[PDB]
UniProtKB/Swiss-Prot annotation:
Domain comment in the entry: Interacts with p70-S6K via its PDZ domain.
Function: Binds to actin filaments (F-actin) and shows cross-linking activity. Binds along the sides of the F-actin. May be involved in neurite formation. Inhibits protein phosphatase 1-alpha activity.
Superkingdom field: Eukaryota
Subunit field text: Possibly exists as a homodimer, homotrimer or a homotetramer. Interacts with F-actin, protein phosphatase 1 (PP1), neurabin-2 and p70-S6K.
Organism whose genome encodes this protein: Homo sapiens (Human)
Entry protein name: Neurabin-1
Gene name in the database record: PPP1R9A
Stretches assigned to the PDZ domain: 12-100
Subcellular compartments: Cytoplasm, Cytoskeleton; Synapse, Synaptosome
Length: 107
């Protein structure tokens, strides 16, 4: 049983580009950095007040775009992610990763 524990809520989120594309910000972070085995994590720095991602409500700030329109934004430098978000078109499928629960909770 080698090391490994990946339990994140990966769900596809459709977004329709607007006069100003999506209208969301991303941040370049280093997830699980193991010297050189680090996996850059593209997170949502913020969401434009009244943007495509905002209006939607689905995508939130601090979110993690694991994938986009199928493109993987894992272990990739912001640049890459930036490029993707720049490649995106009208409709874009953002697969955010939310922390799943673990145990029975009341209300």
């Amino acid at each position: 049983g080698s090391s490994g524990s990946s339990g994140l809520e990966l769900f596809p989120v459709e977004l329709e580009k607007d006069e100003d594309g999506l209208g969301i910000s991303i941040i370049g972070m280093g997830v699980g950095a193991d010297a050189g085995l680090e996996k850059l994590g593209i997170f949502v720095k913020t969401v434009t007040e009244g943007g495509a991602a905002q209006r939607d409500g689905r995508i939130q700030v601090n979110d993690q775009i694991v994938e986009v329109d199928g493109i993987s934004l894992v272990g990739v430098t912001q640049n890459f992610a930036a490029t993707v978000l720049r490649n995106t078109k009208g409709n874009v499928r953002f697969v955010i990763g939310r922390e799943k629960p673990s145990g029975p909770s009341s209300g």
